[PDB]
Amino acid sequence: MLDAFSRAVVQADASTSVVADMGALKQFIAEGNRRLDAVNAIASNASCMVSDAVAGMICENQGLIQAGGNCYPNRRMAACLRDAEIILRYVTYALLAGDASVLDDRCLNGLKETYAALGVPTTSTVRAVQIMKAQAAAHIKDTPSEARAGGKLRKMGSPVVEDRCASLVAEASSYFDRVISALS
Amino acid sequence: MLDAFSRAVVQADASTSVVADMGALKQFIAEGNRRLDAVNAIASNASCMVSDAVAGMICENQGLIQAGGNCYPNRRMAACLRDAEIILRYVTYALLAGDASVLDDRCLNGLKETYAALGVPTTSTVRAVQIMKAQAAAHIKDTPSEARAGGKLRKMGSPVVEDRCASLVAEASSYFDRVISALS
Amino acid sequence: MLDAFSRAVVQADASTSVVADMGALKQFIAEGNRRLDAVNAIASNASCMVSDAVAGMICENQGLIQAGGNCYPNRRMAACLRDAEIILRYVTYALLAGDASVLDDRCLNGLKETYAALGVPTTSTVRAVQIMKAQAAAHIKDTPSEARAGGKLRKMGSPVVEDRCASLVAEASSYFDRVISALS
Amino acid sequence: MLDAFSRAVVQADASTSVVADMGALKQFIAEGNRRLDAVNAIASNASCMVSDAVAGMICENQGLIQAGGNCYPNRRMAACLRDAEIILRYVTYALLAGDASVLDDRCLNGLKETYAALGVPTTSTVRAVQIMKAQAAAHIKDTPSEARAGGKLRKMGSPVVEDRCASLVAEASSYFDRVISALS
Amino acid sequence: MKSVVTTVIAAADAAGRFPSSSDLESVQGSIQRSAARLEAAEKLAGNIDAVAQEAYNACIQKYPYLNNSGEANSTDTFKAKCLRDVKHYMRLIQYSLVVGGTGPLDEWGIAGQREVYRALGLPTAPYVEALSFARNRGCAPRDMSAQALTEYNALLDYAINSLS
Amino acid sequence: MKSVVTTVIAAADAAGRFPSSSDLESVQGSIQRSAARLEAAEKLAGNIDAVAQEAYNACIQKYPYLNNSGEANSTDTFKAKCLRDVKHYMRLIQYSLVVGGTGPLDEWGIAGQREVYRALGLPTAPYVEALSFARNRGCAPRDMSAQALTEYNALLDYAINSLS
Amino acid sequence: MKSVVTTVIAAADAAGRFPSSSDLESVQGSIQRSAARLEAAEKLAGNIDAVAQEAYNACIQKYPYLNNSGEANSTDTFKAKCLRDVKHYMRLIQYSLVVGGTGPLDEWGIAGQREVYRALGLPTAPYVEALSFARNRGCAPRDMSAQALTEYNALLDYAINSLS
Amino acid sequence: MKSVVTTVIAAADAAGRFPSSSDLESVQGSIQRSAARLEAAEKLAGNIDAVAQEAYNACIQKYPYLNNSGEANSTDTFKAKCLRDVKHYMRLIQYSLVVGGTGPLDEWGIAGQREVYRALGLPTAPYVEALSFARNRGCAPRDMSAQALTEYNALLDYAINSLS
Ligand SMILES: *[C@@H](C)[C@H]1/C(=C/C2=NC(=C\c3[nH]c(C[C@H]4NC(=O)C(C=C)=C4C)c(C)c3CCC(=O)O)/C(CCC(=O)O)=C2C)NC(=O)[C@@H]1C
Ligand SMILES: C=CC1=C(C)[C@@H](Cc2[nH]c(/C=C3N=C(/C=C4\NC(=O)[C@H](C)[C@H]4CC)C(C)=C\3CCC(=O)O)c(CCC(=O)O)c2C)NC1=O
Ligand SMILES: C=CC1=C(C)[C@@H](Cc2[nH]c(/C=C3N=C(/C=C4\NC(=O)[C@H](C)[C@H]4CC)C(C)=C\3CCC(=O)O)c(CCC(=O)O)c2C)NC1=O
Ligand SMILES: C=CC1=C(C)[C@@H](Cc2[nH]c(/C=C3N=C(/C=C4\NC(=O)[C@H](C)[C@H]4CC)C(C)=C\3CCC(=O)O)c(CCC(=O)O)c2C)NC1=O
Ligand SMILES: C=CC1=C(C)[C@@H](Cc2[nH]c(/C=C3N=C(/C=C4\NC(=O)[C@H](C)[C@H]4CC)C(C)=C\3CCC(=O)O)c(CCC(=O)O)c2C)NC1=O
Ligand SMILES: C=CC1=C(C)[C@@H](Cc2[nH]c(/C=C3N=C(/C=C4\NC(=O)[C@H](C)[C@H]4CC)C(C)=C\3CCC(=O)O)c(CCC(=O)O)c2C)NC1=O
Ligand SMILES: C=CC1=C(C)[C@@H](Cc2[nH]c(/C=C3N=C(/C=C4\NC(=O)[C@H](C)[C@H]4CC)C(C)=C\3CCC(=O)O)c(CCC(=O)O)c2C)NC1=O
Ligand SMILES: C=CC1=C(C)[C@@H](Cc2[nH]c(/C=C3N=C(/C=C4\NC(=O)[C@H](C)[C@H]4CC)C(C)=C\3CCC(=O)O)c(CCC(=O)O)c2C)NC1=O
Ligand SMILES: C=CC1=C(C)[C@@H](Cc2[nH]c(/C=C3N=C(/C=C4\NC(=O)[C@H](C)[C@H]4CC)C(C)=C\3CCC(=O)O)c(CCC(=O)O)c2C)NC1=O
Ligand SMILES: C=CC1=C(C)[C@@H](Cc2[nH]c(/C=C3N=C(/C=C4\NC(=O)[C@H](C)[C@H]4CC)C(C)=C\3CCC(=O)O)c(CCC(=O)O)c2C)NC1=O
Ligand SMILES: C=CC1=C(C)[C@@H](Cc2[nH]c(/C=C3N=C(/C=C4\NC(=O)[C@H](C)[C@H]4CC)C(C)=C\3CCC(=O)O)c(CCC(=O)O)c2C)NC1=O
Ligand SMILES: C=CC1=C(C)[C@@H](Cc2[nH]c(/C=C3N=C(/C=C4\NC(=O)[C@H](C)[C@H]4CC)C(C)=C\3CCC(=O)O)c(CCC(=O)O)c2C)NC1=O
Ligand SMILES: C=CC1=C(C)[C@@H](Cc2[nH]c(/C=C3N=C(/C=C4\NC(=O)[C@H](C)[C@H]4CC)C(C)=C\3CCC(=O)O)c(CCC(=O)O)c2C)NC1=O
Ligand SMILES: C=CC1=C(C)[C@@H](Cc2[nH]c(/C=C3N=C(/C=C4\NC(=O)[C@H](C)[C@H]4CC)C(C)=C\3CCC(=O)O)c(CCC(=O)O)c2C)NC1=O
Ligand SMILES: [Cl-]
Ligand SMILES: [Cl-]
Ligand code: NA
Ligand code: NA
Ligand code: NA
Ligand code: NA
Ligand code: NA
Ligand code: NA
Ligand code: NA
């Protein structure tokens, strides 16, 4: 797998040239503590995210839990909860590394074809991932709502800036969008 | 693998309903001793059936035992005898279970493609299977002829009914037809 | 593995003789339904038996659940519960077969040496097996007490005879006694 | 495996107690950068150390490179060079961790018996390890001599203190002494 | 799917054997025991809603906290799902009686159940109480013959053991 | 040693399972079928010498070349060993009727038989004819009940199939 | 036991490598972050009994049904064991702060927990609520610095995730 | 490609784990050490041609036999390729400084090097001498800071060890 810095190296090696641009590298370093806070916000809330996103997919599509549905019987529900967690785990690796290669190579390559052979429904897969994308954005910004969490609400307490880490929210969102594109 | 009763339960689960009609199940049970006799009639005679079926395939097509023929040399004849016995064994498992899933899943899946890649001739394999079908019908009815037995005639001694287990003969014959369909 | 009948065959073969005592085989068969009741009584109550036996070993020896004790920390308690269930499983196989060979060969051979290398305490292991021996006796006779049931009492409802299956209680008790002898 | 901090935790767990001595932990942290320099000094000079230590063992015992000797023929010399490097590598892990458990568990357990079965001579093994111990002390202190190095001499340029890291020298020396202890 | 006949076929196939003496003898056991388990299956088919209702009612009676705000029996949607789940277990027991092995309960009920309930924060004690009530409720000859009851109770106790 | 009960126990142990419904149901099969196979076992225990003697006589009648100089029934030692061998097969059939599976015949008769006969230059056709005569000889109800005879005949055919 | 340094050594050993640049870099991270996590470890060491007591009280306040006859907080022995358990989790959290990785919590708390609680009929919700109360309780700078509180809260969340 | 963050991710993935405390702590090490290694990388990006040219010159000064007919520095093509090869090694060290692990040197320089040089009859001592000269040449603060030089020197020594 690659990370943000080895990505730069591979691009330079394509022309057997030195890495000349230190500036963009130094910006990654400058935002390093806020990146670690963003990964902590997802990892610390992962069980609540997965169970809420799968529940949400289901409340919006009740055919999934009726006769012939893809979250029936218990074993299929259990497999779906497992897959939502897997996908979230690879997205979190990509955010830690600052590059999508680990998510492409170890999760997404071949996954559309796997799901077509099993009959796992694309519309419902995409909806589960979209809910997780929304959840992740709110936890990174440290602005989850009581309306969506009740007594399970968590606050991170990271130091606030006016943009609430807009660049990292856009980067995290791009990795969820990559999953949706691969699977659609 | 499924059996006749688990096939019925798969049907009921497609509508998440209890198994209500038990008339067909109670008849399967009432015919259980006759089904055990039918299995005993094929297993007890299996070596004679296999050798006489491959020998008949050959006496009707002498090209199989000459230069370039698929039962020449000794290793090929031995492989063919082995395959006729494998086929008959899986048909007997299907008759004991009252369901073709064990035959489909563990014997027929990929068999056409395997024989195509080896140059095993379809026409000749089908004839061997047709001869085994006829043999099994006569052994289930307990009416093999002296003319075909070659000095090795066996009588089973089961309790005779007027129809001679016609329903079981038809079911056994349908399993051999499934083998032929996989190759055609 | 051997069963009660194949045991008798091995004994007859040591003098290359036919098995002549048909009376004794017949009485074994006459008790077959009560044997199947006895096995059902153990298997149906297994989780309650295991958890009550390991808890009783502990309540009698609190050293096991303090620093340096062999059921501390969580991983060790869980391994102990696992082993009490494995032992009961092999005892129930011996009762079903009517012969100890499965228990000797697949569970007991090398167990004492395994435990000595790990430091699993012998006295405590023997006490857990003693509690299971007592539980099994009561469930086979269908006379468990309310005082011991912890509010989870079960009745089997098998047809009562005056002896309450004393012969089968002695047999089951003998297999637990083989476990105790092996570990002592 | 354990490190210096988890070793302290295992010690506290023996009386189910919190870790209370923060001062000892803070000292290990204070000397952290020095420890990194010590590990860098050994790893960076490893090839020179192994070759010089094996060559020194040989110049002090010429029997090793004559018929019957354990560094004759080429295959045996190659195996001995490999083993000296393996030993050094495990010692450097112990230094990085501040605990000998990875050295004891992955290198030393079974080594005496392995060597006895092969006929690898203990006397000569001890000498190679002694020379590596001396080399490591001089590189950690950044005082190697021109006399023992020639044109291969390397200087590390770590920031000098009056005691030249005496406590790290004594700890590294203790891990080489454990290697020698494991041979008896 | 595990039954008498699929067990003996799988064992014969692993050794490359035709069906033999002990395989046919095993299947005769199914012919003999089918009267008791099919009697239980037909009673359960005709009365499943009432059997599941009383088991559900008994688990909420034991654990009235589940009715409190935020708990698993507290909304009309949750109440309907909890009754449904007790009925799912009873329907799998009915299928298991039809097949004569635990296959349908193993594959479609037990597999994955602990992972599901942990993810949704559903306590396992009320499931065990529902099944426990059902196990202690039957008596013969009132509800069915003594051997039909033995078959029904053994499948209840198999489910209880998987949660315990 | 393969029987009804050892087959279900080995299957249960491979999956880590206590005995369950389909295991007990299989053993009920043994309880039901034991009357037939034990009847056959008793008739064979009481008459094994005469049953073996006439099967041996038939195989020599079919193949009188065996009595010629150098052949496998030609000396007094050879004659005694051939009759002994036919009796061994019938004894292992008796054991297999007792157990209710083919175990004793598989392990003590069939395993190695082809290798032994090839090494000694013994033809297989006389073994097949001895067993074939025994298979066609019995009738019911004279010798035993129809179902006792079905069990005896199935084991003879199993031994014939192993040599054919 | 999982920490920064044992992770990198395990990786190096699997490839046959001496410690190299990225290994030394990783351990510099331990040097930097230690001040925050050892601040939290010292606060918890000095006040573990009060921290555990109030978390235990919170879980019983949420689930008073546990005090009813037969239930898991209903006797004096049970009450002591439950409090003890909450203190065991907090102690393993203390150890994980000292080490800088989750190793102590993984090996001595989490491994086996679900099997133990299943066997004894202990609900997992009250464990979750005790840890959740502790996770929501702290504030900075009152209790400790903001970065120390981040470390303490992350390990509480790791434990809650293992039960959820 | 081996770095601080890819090592911790690979370890977490092998155990099916989210990033946890020790993984974040490792990456803080990269934040701290980056200043020194990126200083060294910037120096090398600006002056790689001169650094390689003097190291090449030193290895030829040392082994003038390479200029003789048939030897590895004897033709204009050979002289260009040897200098190119020293510059390749320096570029791969620049890469390794950017990444903070040895990945680029391991995958694109070290792997295969001994098989290539053996096939072409290229001696390894001149390669070692070029890298040795470069290792002994630098001084701080003239060329870069003391810790920047420590990082540059450790990568030179890693290359030297791979050829020794
Ligand atoms: C676990 C509770 C977390 C947590 C989770 C968040 N959920 C967020 C948004 C969200 N969740 C759902 C599913 C929900 N809606 C339904 O209609 C049903 C079933 C009836 C369910 C189960 C949806 C649809 C959404 C919106 C997704 C979208 O925008 O497309 C969310 C982000 C929004 C917010 O916080 O306001 C979070 C963070 N929050 C917590 O604090 C705990 C740890
Ligand atoms: C080993 C574990 C470990 C971590 C978890 C982080 C923890 C951490 N985060 C920050 C520091 C910070 N963290 C954030 C984060 C955010 N600000 C917002 O408005 C959003 C809610 C959120 C989006 C991600 C911000 C903005 C800073 C201040 C520095 C900056 O501007 O980048 C700092 C620097 C100290 C300080 O500024 O107070 C540290 C040590 N670092 C580590 O070493
Ligand atoms: C579980 C199901 C299952 C099967 C059905 C068989 C299928 C099968 N058959 C053969 C192999 C063969 N099968 C035959 C069969 C025949 N030749 C003829 O002329 C006749 C028409 C015909 C018998 C009726 C021959 C001759 C070969 C050998 C082909 C060769 O090597 O040239 C092979 C190749 C490997 C080998 O040599 O054994 C396989 C996989 N194997 C299985 O595992
Ligand atoms: C010259 C080569 C040549 C042969 C080898 C045979 C091959 C052969 N056998 C049978 C047909 C049969 N073969 C058998 C077999 C047996 N019956 C027993 O009692 C024994 C146990 C066992 C092995 C001998 C049986 C039972 C039939 C069924 C028809 C019958 O019994 O009349 C058929 C009829 C198939 C059909 O109807 O399509 C043919 C063609 N015929 C030939 O032309
Ligand atoms: C363990 C081994 C085992 C077996 C091998 C069977 C053996 C068996 N078969 C039947 C009984 C029977 N078997 C047959 C069979 C046939 N009738 C015909 O005319 C055809 C020749 C043949 C086709 C299959 C019939 C017709 C009956 C009578 C019952 C019925 O009508 O189904 C009976 C019941 C007793 C009786 O009716 O006499 C038994 C025990 N059962 C076992 O437990
Ligand atoms: C303070 C802790 C402590 C314990 C945990 C128990 C443990 C325990 N249980 C039993 C004894 C038993 N335990 C059971 C178990 C059960 N009966 C059922 O109806 C259920 C299905 C099932 C699980 C509860 C049975 C059947 C007996 C046999 C005695 C009896 O029933 O009276 C015995 C007697 C053992 C002997 O006779 O040698 C002991 C010590 N005792 C203690 O002092
Ligand atoms: C005739 C054969 C023969 C040998 C091969 C040497 C072997 C040798 N080397 C050293 C001793 C040493 N050898 C080295 C090695 C090195 N220093 C560097 O700067 C390089 C990087 C690297 C490989 C050359 C070092 C650092 C010491 C420690 C002593 C010192 O530097 O003065 C010692 C002393 C060990 C002791 O104190 O017990 C011996 C015996 N001596 C012999 O008599
Ligand atoms: C990731 C790679 C990495 C490293 C290789 C080290 C490198 C390193 N070493 C020291 C700093 C030091 N290094 C040493 C080492 C020694 N002194 C001697 O006299 C002996 C020759 C030698 C024995 C080991 C000493 C003594 C200090 C000064 C601090 C102290 O006294 O501990 C410092 C701190 C400098 C400062 O104050 O700014 C750093 C960053 N750290 C890292 O992060
Ligand atoms: C498929 C399985 C199946 C069952 C197990 C039963 C379960 C069941 N039992 C009862 C109902 C009953 N069951 C009993 C039985 C008993 N009372 C005792 O105290 C004795 C120990 C025991 C044996 C006499 C009694 C007395 C009632 C009526 C009173 C009551 O509701 O308790 C009812 C309510 C309707 C009715 O009157 O029948 C139901 C649904 N029904 C089924 O369909
Ligand atoms: C343990 C298994 C067992 C067997 C299978 C038989 C085998 C057997 N059968 C017969 C002996 C006999 N067997 C039969 C049977 C028949 N004759 C026919 O024409 C019908 C087709 C058939 C059914 C009536 C007859 C009539 C005799 C006496 C005549 C003879 O020897 O052939 C004898 C000689 C002793 C005697 O008279 O009984 C023996 C050993 N005995 C056994 O102990
Ligand atoms: C437990 C199962 C079991 C068996 C079935 C026998 C099988 C068997 N038979 C013989 C040995 C023999 N068996 C025969 C048999 C025959 N002669 C004929 O004319 C016919 C072909 C045939 C009877 C039908 C002869 C003649 C020998 C002696 C052969 C020799 O020494 O060359 C031997 C070699 C050792 C010996 O000399 O005894 C063995 C292992 N033994 C066993 O342990
Ligand atoms: C090792 C970890 C560790 C902790 C996390 C704390 C946990 C803790 N907090 C409080 C106690 C307190 N904690 C708070 C904190 C707050 N109240 C608010 O309304 C704000 C949201 C928040 C930030 C100021 C307050 C105000 C009290 C006193 C009142 C109360 O008990 O609720 C107490 C009771 C003893 C005391 O008064 O200090 C304890 C044990 N202590 C520790 O040793
Ligand atoms: C990415 C990393 C990487 C490298 C490090 C080089 C490594 C390398 N060098 C050469 C090839 C060569 N390298 C040299 C080198 C030298 N002559 C001397 O006197 C000295 C011993 C030495 C410089 C120190 C020579 C002379 C050749 C050509 C040899 C020939 O063709 O016989 C070749 C063969 C293909 C070619 O002709 O280019 C390769 C793969 N290439 C790479 O892709
Ligand atoms: C990227 C890495 C990088 C390097 C390591 C250096 C390498 C380097 N050093 C020197 C050049 C030099 N380097 C030194 C250094 C020293 N002289 C001594 O005697 C001391 C031990 C040591 C510390 C003062 C000196 C004195 C010169 C000038 C004289 C000379 O060329 O030797 C030059 C020639 C150009 C110049 O004058 O700077 C080059 C390319 N440059 C780089 O870009
Ligand atoms: Cl629970
Ligand atoms: Cl060379
Ligand atoms: Na797409
Ligand atoms: Na257990
Ligand atoms: Na030695
Ligand atoms: Na259980
Ligand atoms: Na055969
Ligand atoms: Na979880
Ligand atoms: Na080397």
Numbering used by the authors:
A (entry chain N), B (entry chain O), C (entry chain R), D (entry chain Q): 1 to 184
E (entry chain C), F (entry chain F), G (entry chain E), H (entry chain B): 1 to 164
Lines from the paper:
The description of the atomic resolution structure of PE will be presented here using the model based on the 1.14 Å data for the crystal grown in NPS conditions (Morpheus C8) while the model based on the 1.38 Å data (crystal grown in carboxylic acids mix, Morpheus G8) will only be mentioned explicitly in the cases of significant structural differences. However, another of the two PE structures we are reporting here, the one refined based on the 1.38 Å data obtained for the crystal grown in the mix of carboxylic acids (Morpheus screen G8 condition) presents another case. In that structure, the conformation of the 146–152 fragment of the loop in β-subunits M and X is the same as in the 1.14 Å structure, but the situation in β-subunits N to W is different. Another more tentative binding site for phosphate was also identified in the α-subunit forming H-bonds with residues Gly112, Arg114 and Glu115. Both these sites are close to the central cavity inside each trimer.
